[PDB]
A paper describes a structure:
The [name]-1 Env is a trimer of gp120-gp41 heterodimers that are heavily shielded from the host immune systems by N-linked glycosylation and further protected from neutralization by conformational masking and considerable sequence variability. Here, we determine structures of antibodies in complex with [name]-1 Envelope for all observed members and ancestral states of the broadly neutralizing [name]-1 V3-glycan targeting [name] antibody clonal B cell lineage.
The upper path from I2 leads to the I1 intermediate and then onto the mature [name].4 and [name].5 antibodies. In I1, two mutations with possible impacts on the LCDR2 loop, N62H, and R65W, could affect N332-glycan D1 arm interactions. This loop was, however, poorly resolved, limiting our ability to determine what, if any, impact these mutations have.
Numbering used by the authors:
A (entry chain B), B (entry chain L), C (entry chain G): 512 to 547, 569 to 664
D (entry chain F): 32 to 139, 150 to 185, 185a, 185b, 186 to 309, 312 to 321, 321c, 322 to 354, ...
E (entry chain K): 196 to 248
F (entry chain A): 136 to 139, 150 to 185, 185a, 185b, 186 to 195
The structure:
Amino acid sequence: AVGIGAVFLGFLGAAGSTMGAASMTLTVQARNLLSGTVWGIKQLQARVLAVERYLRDQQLLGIWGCSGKLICCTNVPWNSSWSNRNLSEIWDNMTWLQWDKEISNYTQIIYGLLEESQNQQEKNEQDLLALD
Amino acid sequence: AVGIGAVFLGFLGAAGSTMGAASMTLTVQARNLLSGTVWGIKQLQARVLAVERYLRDQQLLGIWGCSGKLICCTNVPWNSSWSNRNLSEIWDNMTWLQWDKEISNYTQIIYGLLEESQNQQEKNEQDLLALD
Amino acid sequence: AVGIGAVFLGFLGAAGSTMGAASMTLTVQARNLLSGTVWGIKQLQARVLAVERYLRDQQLLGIWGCSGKLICCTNVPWNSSWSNRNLSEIWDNMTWLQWDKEISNYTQIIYGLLEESQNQQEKNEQDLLALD
Amino acid sequence: ENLWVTVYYGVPVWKEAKTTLFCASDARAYEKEVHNVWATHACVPTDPSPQELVLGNVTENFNMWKNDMVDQMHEDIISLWDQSLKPCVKLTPLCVTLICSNATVKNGTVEEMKNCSFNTTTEIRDKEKKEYALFYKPDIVPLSETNNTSEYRLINCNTSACTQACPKVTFEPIPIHYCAPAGYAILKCNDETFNGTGPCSNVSTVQCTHGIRPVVSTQLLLNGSLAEKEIVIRSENLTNNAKIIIVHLHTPVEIVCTRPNNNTRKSVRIGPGQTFYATGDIIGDIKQAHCNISEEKWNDTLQKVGIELQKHFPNKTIKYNQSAGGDMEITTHSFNCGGEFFYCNTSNLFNGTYNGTYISTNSSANSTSTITLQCRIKQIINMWQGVGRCMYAPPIAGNITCRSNITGLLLTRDGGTNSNETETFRPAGGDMRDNWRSELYKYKVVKIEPLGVAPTRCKRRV
Amino acid sequence: CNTSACTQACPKVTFEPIPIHYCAPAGYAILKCNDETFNGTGPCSNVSTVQCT
Amino acid sequence: VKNGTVEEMKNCSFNTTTEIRDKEKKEYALFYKPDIVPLSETNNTSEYRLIN
Ligand SMILES: *[C@@H]1O[C@H](CO)[C@@H](O[C@@H]2O[C@H](CO)[C@@H](O[C@@H]3O[C@H](CO)[C@@H](O)[C@H](O)[C@@H]3O)[C@H](O)[C@H]2NC(C)=O)[C@H](O)[C@H]1NC(C)=O
């Protein structure tokens, strides 16, 4: 089963396979993102690219409000025009590599909808805690 | 309303306005803090310094115990001598830019009080979970 | 008491003392992990090392599933062969500097067990939220 | 009840490791111009914080001879040095045939120099003029197999050509604070009885080190740090005759050196604008450059180093002997003084002995009675290997003095014979690693391992 | 030659005053005075923000 | 040496600035023919230049 425990799938071993299996073992794609040691100025620049791009990816995952932040649900509706495809088709049949080609046309809107919804939730939760 | 949804206020569009409105749209001041690409050693230092200063600001927000970490309440009481000003005056009338001039005289004490209180809460929560 | 409040133990003041006290004041060992300013290429290489190593330590602590991320419990049982030592002996009598020598032979297995258990918990929690 | 692995972050744990340290210096150096002195430009301003906090319950093993940080400092100094002499004038029109005149003044213990006249390319690059300048004898070599005793060459040009040190930078041993980068820390031994290796059972932690002196000195250690309570001896393995033995003193032995010769700085122009500085006339009487040490204090310090050598060689008296001989820069006490670089014949110092019982200097006949060392001086300096291996130190116009403190000795045990009761030690410490190794003896860098896992009675709520 | 050695400008580079935008690094911003009446010092009571000049 | 399929080189003698910067000596070294070009329009078949 995909719940290997002693997961060994390297950098990208979940690629190509069905999204139902790739939903597990996300950590190997996340854990590996930082590595390397120094040579000169050029590969020092290469080293900073990993750091800065990773922290950018964490900015996006942070202002969207994830808790246990490598999977989190959201309150923004899936406007069906974004996929117009069945849930079972997306998760069981398709793969993440192919799914990138579908949603990538529309990501920049979702990346702000999640932001504003999370900020709304933050203020509302502070208000509820004050009322409590 | 300040709940724009498609927020467009750039780097600092909430500056000057009342703190009641600037309490929302905090994300644009937070999202924009990483960017740029390389020219030589001199500006590569600028690129690295932005990342380091951000991570420092995250150290402070992390050891203080914020969950949903761009707004979080704390258990440290507001010793009134820090402001001696009404809550409604602070939030409705004043602005963040002006509020900096008030609290900045005393920030270094709060930055340790939150630290020790959060660590106290961490141990107490582990103890309660053990007793449960 | 170790709940000093105005904690002043510098970088490492808890080292050597009993782990019962060093369980408190973890923040000073965590807060101090970023600092320094410019001297050319060599010090810049030193500076990037600090940021990258800190972010690595945050990767490990994040994929393991901690909430309030400087102490967290886990669901992975302590296979007793890792220590074969009493809990009171570990926490009261002994110190962290010595405990490094015991567990360091076996850390790399735990660092993956926590990973897989956390990802399992994430998927199970999403499933439970869906069923709710 | 069952135990589950619980992870702690912010955890005090160490690994001794290699790291790139900062360079830090005091604030008073930063109002000056660029690289005057280098600490103003190539190092960060320091901060006294944090305090020298003490980790009372700790025990940690320290080392000097497997220590990486002394080698890292050596590399830092060499690389900075190449960076410092890069913009200065490259010379190379000085290797023209120097015609050096004889003199009717009687030779002897006066350190007579050679008045050498030579052709230079003036500011008109394709035109020349005759110019004269006085060079010390060690700077000068007879020309070639096409022998003429009146014609000479600089000691370089049998070697990679040499570069003058710009007068805009001065080579004072400015204190340098080395600091571990963020995420690392430095552990400082608090026990004064540390003997070079093994556990210091009482340690302190600092982010920045003492204001280490980057001092250039061969046979004696100049302006260095001092031990808190007792004279100390340090060596990787005293069994070996080849390994250097460092001695570190409780109180300093004052040393004063000087040029009584009153040089005048000549300003020769070499090609496009850049100037070459050289010694002009000796405006004054010719006199011997030398060094001085208070004789009774040196005797006391040497006999006390005798008692400390007896702790490792109990059944023997200690004899001190002349230096090793051979190369001038190795056998002599070479050190920096004000801009000039002295080379002293220390055979007059290391000539006494310890009888196994202290010989009283009290009551003192005259505390200002001095032992004198007569020192050569070089301008062309072959400082190090792989640094470009050359400096021309320009002459500075005055009868200079560099009154300073001795705080350590670099001896070496001679070859044994007959298991003799009096087996001897010679000054032979050549490498400049040992100077900083004698001063960085308290310190080791630790890599923080802030992520530890331990058991306790709690499992994650689900 | 009453001065340090001097160097020719290579014809492969031309010294046109090309426009240069100075930009603050990430985490900093440049505030731009919007009031045309600014006299070199003192408060601009109307300001705009730009990452590049 | 007789020409042919033997790849004979040219024995070139030239003045060098010795260790003494403003003194010179005649020195000889053999260079392959592709490294060597005849001098200039001030033509002399016995005088040559490096191909740089
Ligand atoms: C060049 O040589 C002259 C002597 O020919 C130096 O001047 C003399 O220096 C001595 C230093 O010992 C002065 O004596 C006294 O020294 C004591 C230290 O014990 C100090 O406390 C006194 O206040 C005083 O300075 C002496 O007065 C002075 N002048 C003469 C005429 O002897 C001169 O210092 C040398 N050049 C340089 C740059 O040092």
